[PDB]
């Protein structure tokens, strides 16, 4: 259960854009600074910038 501190604007279809306060279910966070998050609001996959999210 992570939270995107800032709004992220996905630049490709392989990532999901979130907003400040949007909850994102982290998935894979062992590759680099970007992890695969799953939006629970609609239910879609989309990488995410770890520098914009934080562990709550």
């Amino acid at each position: 259960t992570f939270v995107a501190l800032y709004d992220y604007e996905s630049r490709t279809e392989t990532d999901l854009s979130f907003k400040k306060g949007e909850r994102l279910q982290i998935v894979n966070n062992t590759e680099g600074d970007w992890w695969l998050a799953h939006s629970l609001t609609t239910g879609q996959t989309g990488y995410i910038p770890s520098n914009y999210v934080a562990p709550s």
């Binding site: 800032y6 630049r11 590759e31 680099g32 600074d33 770890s50």
Partner: peptide
């Protein structure tokens, strides 16, 4: 907020 970082690794 910081500048968008490099996606994990550079393509290959």
């Amino acid at each position: 907020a910081p500048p968008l970082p490099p996606r994990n690794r550079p393509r290959l």
